[PDB]
Design a protein around this nucleic acid. Sequence first.
RNA 1: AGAGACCGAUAGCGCACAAGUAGAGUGAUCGAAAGAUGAAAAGCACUUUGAAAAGAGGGUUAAAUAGCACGUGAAAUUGUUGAAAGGGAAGCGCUUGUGACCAGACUUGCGCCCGGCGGAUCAUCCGGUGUUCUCACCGGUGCACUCCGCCGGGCUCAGGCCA
RNA 2: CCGGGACCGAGGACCGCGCUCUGCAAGGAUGCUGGCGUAAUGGUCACCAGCGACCCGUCUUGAAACACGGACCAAGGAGUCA
RNA 3: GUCCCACCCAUACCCCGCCCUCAGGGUAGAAACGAUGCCCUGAGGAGUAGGCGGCCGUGGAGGUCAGUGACGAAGCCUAGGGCGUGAGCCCGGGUCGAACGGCCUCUAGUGCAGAUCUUGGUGGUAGUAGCAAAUACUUCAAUGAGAACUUGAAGGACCGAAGUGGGGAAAGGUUCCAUGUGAACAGCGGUUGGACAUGGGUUAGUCGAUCCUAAGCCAUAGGGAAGUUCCGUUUCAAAGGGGC
RNA 4: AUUAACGAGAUUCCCACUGUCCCUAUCUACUAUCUAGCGAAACCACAGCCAAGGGAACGGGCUUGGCAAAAUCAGCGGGGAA
RNA 5: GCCGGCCUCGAAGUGGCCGUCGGUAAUUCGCGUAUUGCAAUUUAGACACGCGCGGGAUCAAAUCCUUUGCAGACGACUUAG
Length: 186
Amino acid sequence: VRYAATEIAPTKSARARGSYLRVSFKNTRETAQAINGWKLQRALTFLQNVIDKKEAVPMRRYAGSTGRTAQGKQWGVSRARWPVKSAQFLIGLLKNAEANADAKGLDTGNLIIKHIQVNQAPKQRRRTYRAHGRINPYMSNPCHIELILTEAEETVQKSEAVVRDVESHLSSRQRGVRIRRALTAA
RNA sequence: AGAGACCGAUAGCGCACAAGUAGAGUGAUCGAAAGAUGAAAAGCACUUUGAAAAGAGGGUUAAAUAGCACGUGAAAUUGUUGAAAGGGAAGCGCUUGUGACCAGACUUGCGCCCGGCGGAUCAUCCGGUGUUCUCACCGGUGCACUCCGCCGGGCUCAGGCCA
RNA sequence: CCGGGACCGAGGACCGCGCUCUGCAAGGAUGCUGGCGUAAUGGUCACCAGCGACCCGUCUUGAAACACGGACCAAGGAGUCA
RNA sequence: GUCCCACCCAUACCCCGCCCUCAGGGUAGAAACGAUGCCCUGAGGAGUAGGCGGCCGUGGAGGUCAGUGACGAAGCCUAGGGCGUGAGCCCGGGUCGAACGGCCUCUAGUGCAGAUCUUGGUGGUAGUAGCAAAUACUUCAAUGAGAACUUGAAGGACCGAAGUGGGGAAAGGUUCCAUGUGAACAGCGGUUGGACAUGGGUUAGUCGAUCCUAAGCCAUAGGGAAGUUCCGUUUCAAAGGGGC
RNA sequence: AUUAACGAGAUUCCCACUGUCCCUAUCUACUAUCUAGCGAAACCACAGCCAAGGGAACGGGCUUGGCAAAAUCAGCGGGGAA
RNA sequence: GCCGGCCUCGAAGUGGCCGUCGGUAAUUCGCGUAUUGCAAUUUAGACACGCGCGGGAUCAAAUCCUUUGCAGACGACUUAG
Ligand SMILES: [K+]
Ligand SMILES: [K+]
Ligand SMILES: [K+]
Ligand SMILES: [K+]
Ligand SMILES: [K+]
Ligand SMILES: [K+]
Ligand SMILES: [K+]
Ligand SMILES: [K+]
Ligand SMILES: [K+]
Ligand SMILES: [K+]
Ligand SMILES: [K+]
Ligand SMILES: [K+]
Ligand SMILES: [K+]
Ligand SMILES: [K+]
Ligand SMILES: [K+]
Ligand SMILES: [K+]
Ligand SMILES: [K+]
Ligand SMILES: [K+]
Ligand SMILES: [K+]
Ligand SMILES: [K+]
Ligand SMILES: [K+]
Ligand SMILES: [K+]
Ligand SMILES: [K+]
Ligand SMILES: [K+]
Ligand SMILES: [K+]
Ligand SMILES: [Mg+2]
Ligand SMILES: [Mg+2]
Ligand SMILES: [Mg+2]
Ligand SMILES: [Mg+2]
Ligand SMILES: [Mg+2]
Ligand SMILES: [Mg+2]
Ligand SMILES: [Mg+2]
Ligand SMILES: [Mg+2]
Ligand SMILES: [Mg+2]
Ligand SMILES: [Mg+2]
Ligand SMILES: [Mg+2]
Ligand SMILES: [Mg+2]
Ligand SMILES: [Mg+2]
Ligand SMILES: [Mg+2]
Ligand SMILES: [Mg+2]
Ligand SMILES: [Mg+2]
Ligand SMILES: [Mg+2]
Ligand SMILES: [Mg+2]
Ligand SMILES: [Mg+2]
Ligand SMILES: [Mg+2]
Ligand SMILES: [Mg+2]
Ligand SMILES: [Mg+2]
Ligand SMILES: [Mg+2]
Ligand SMILES: [Mg+2]
Ligand SMILES: [Mg+2]
Ligand SMILES: [Mg+2]
Ligand SMILES: [Mg+2]
Ligand SMILES: [Mg+2]
Ligand SMILES: [Mg+2]
Ligand SMILES: [Mg+2]
Ligand SMILES: [Mg+2]
Ligand SMILES: [Mg+2]
Ligand SMILES: [Mg+2]
Ligand SMILES: [Mg+2]
Ligand SMILES: [Mg+2]
Ligand SMILES: [Mg+2]
Ligand SMILES: [Mg+2]
Ligand SMILES: [Mg+2]
Ligand SMILES: [Mg+2]
Ligand SMILES: [Mg+2]
Ligand SMILES: [Mg+2]
Ligand SMILES: [Mg+2]
Ligand SMILES: [Mg+2]
Ligand SMILES: [Mg+2]
Ligand SMILES: [Mg+2]
Ligand SMILES: [Mg+2]
Ligand SMILES: [Mg+2]
Ligand SMILES: [Mg+2]
Ligand SMILES: [Mg+2]
Ligand SMILES: [Mg+2]
Ligand SMILES: [Mg+2]
Ligand SMILES: [Mg+2]
Ligand SMILES: [Mg+2]
């Protein structure tokens, strides 16, 4: 179908997606944002350390009236949590993409999370019961997830010069000064 | 049974659909929401990862930016990427600056002279036909200092923006 | 009667009132010269800077009001017919 | 306190340009004119409630452009352009798939920010308030992708015969039993379920109903009431049953 | 007008008793609090630091001053004429 | 004026002496200047920052984690590894 990047050619990359997944959208957004631009192996290790509560996911946007911990000093922040259920879903998709890379014939030794994105899905409906005979809604917030992996090169050492454009519409008095200084210096 | 300067799915009857239906009330009674894949299902064979739901390849089609959560697909609200600002709100009016991006205008035209090239037939007169009854058209004559077109060289004039 | 500066050039054949009368400053700007011919002049947007700037609708002598309605968006919504 | 110079700036005053409104003139033996046009001259411009004029848009109808269109109509997006004082009009780029427009007349269910307005959809609050009555769970093994709330065994506990036990009446209607299972439901999980799918299950001369009458309700004889119907139950009635 | 017995009926004093008080201290269980899973509602013109002034005679916004530095957690009951 | 050697300077650390080297109309001359076309900033200073060479010098810590209870709602704090 149509991924959101559209500038990555589906020949030198691998991708995976999943839709209508019944997990918290707010928790998954904070988890996906922590692993973005990382290597495939570093990310897989990190997600398991979260499940075992040895490393923490920093909460930046959706962090209203939450708790504090010492495992957040790694990220320079003070509020962090351990979204176990979110990490499980992400690991499943990262494994599927890595499997897709092997079938194509890529080199899984150095792959990079190039694109990762979480969107809101249609909600599901339940009800509560309140005092004085009133009924209120009780809803869940699922999500869509997709990602793309590409190889890393980080190899550019080409810098341009004034060759692209030269002084082209100078005045007659400007041209006179340039020539005189050229003659004097040589 | 035939029609209309009527309405076009929040409209028109409450009902374009298994509608006086599903549902509520002890009962008399109350009473909805809900139309559109494609010309044709040709409704995705096979391989691979996964416990499975599914994903990635590969197929059908004019089109999958039409996959049954299906014509087109707006706003509120949200994700990623890119650009920028932030010492107890922000937004707005007048006027410069910086950065990014951009519409026009201009590229020549008429005339005169000199040379070359090509074609005619320029003025006049005779016949025919129109018409505003004196002005034209067609046929014939004309045949090189006339008429028309192109190219080469020189000259005058007019031409864009800011001073 | 002589100097020094600033802003402006509407009109588009002739005709008029006149004068210092081969002509003119008299019913509204012409003459000469240089640079450049493109993002240079010009335009749109974003942001910083100087000055300015109370929330709309409504009743009321008097509304920014410690007076009432208004969380946001789409579609419907009120002087007609005999 | 009194007197004197110079200087600063209002949308006021003076001069110039342009817009509109009002007033006054010119223009045919027509080489003549959107005569509803064009040329010349002067003055003026605040505004709620309210009055009048001119114009711009929307859905349909008659006429006309011998109008545009699958070589792409309509609709939608666009810190890309041009015109208009303004409501608005026109063009470029993208998406898309079957109809649509200009001009003069005709016609109306014809122009929205408000009405604690109607229907539908969506935010901040916010991963927040909370998920704390009824004393309580622990070890090993097995099943399974996955086990605190599934099964076995072993410990520890509660109900304590006016029971958290064994059976019924009203009410419900398959909730009963076996096998299996993706989603949804069991406000945590779930391999378990009163959930979901496929099959099976209720046997009477003796237990009930059926028979009798109670409080009561309604037919028949009759009397009211325009009538739907009201009274009346043994009465002011020629009202039955037994044998060969 | 009196009146034995009776009263979850109204009132005054006495004995015993005590954290009602001088004057407050300590302990236990469940919360709150942190984590995994699940997950609402009221309300909302726009917002949210002050002193004085004038003003519809008690300003978050106006005028003149004081000042003024990211993003945040547990409590609190002055104001928001909540 | 750049360097080097001696002294000196504490309010937010400065000045002086000496030496080598380089430049230098107080007087008077000889060659060069044009064409930037009759104006168009006189692109010229000082500090910061970046980049590229060539030489020297150097081989460190903090957080998570486990632990303590002189501390504590959670972070944080006093300790040990
Ligand atoms: K908290
Ligand atoms: K209806
Ligand atoms: K019913
Ligand atoms: K086609
Ligand atoms: K295709
Ligand atoms: K389509
Ligand atoms: K004028
Ligand atoms: K009112
Ligand atoms: K109000
Ligand atoms: K119309
Ligand atoms: K287009
Ligand atoms: K949650
Ligand atoms: K309990
Ligand atoms: K119990
Ligand atoms: K029987
Ligand atoms: K028998
Ligand atoms: K029976
Ligand atoms: K019977
Ligand atoms: K009886
Ligand atoms: K009767
Ligand atoms: K009593
Ligand atoms: K609390
Ligand atoms: K939690
Ligand atoms: K006051
Ligand atoms: K003001
Ligand atoms: Mg708080
Ligand atoms: Mg709390
Ligand atoms: Mg409740
Ligand atoms: Mg109730
Ligand atoms: Mg919600
Ligand atoms: Mg009909
Ligand atoms: Mg509908
Ligand atoms: Mg309808
Ligand atoms: Mg549809
Ligand atoms: Mg497929
Ligand atoms: Mg298409
Ligand atoms: Mg949808
Ligand atoms: Mg669609
Ligand atoms: Mg949007
Ligand atoms: Mg701003
Ligand atoms: Mg002839
Ligand atoms: Mg002029
Ligand atoms: Mg020139
Ligand atoms: Mg510019
Ligand atoms: Mg002001
Ligand atoms: Mg007040
Ligand atoms: Mg009122
Ligand atoms: Mg209100
Ligand atoms: Mg409609
Ligand atoms: Mg007026
Ligand atoms: Mg209509
Ligand atoms: Mg089109
Ligand atoms: Mg836009
Ligand atoms: Mg079609
Ligand atoms: Mg209407
Ligand atoms: Mg509206
Ligand atoms: Mg209004
Ligand atoms: Mg909580
Ligand atoms: Mg509970
Ligand atoms: Mg509670
Ligand atoms: Mg239990
Ligand atoms: Mg007991
Ligand atoms: Mg006991
Ligand atoms: Mg059972
Ligand atoms: Mg079972
Ligand atoms: Mg549950
Ligand atoms: Mg579950
Ligand atoms: Mg289950
Ligand atoms: Mg069932
Ligand atoms: Mg019996
Ligand atoms: Mg009767
Ligand atoms: Mg009778
Ligand atoms: Mg105050
Ligand atoms: Mg006062
Ligand atoms: Mg206020
Ligand atoms: Mg101020
Ligand atoms: Mg409180
Ligand atoms: Mg208060």
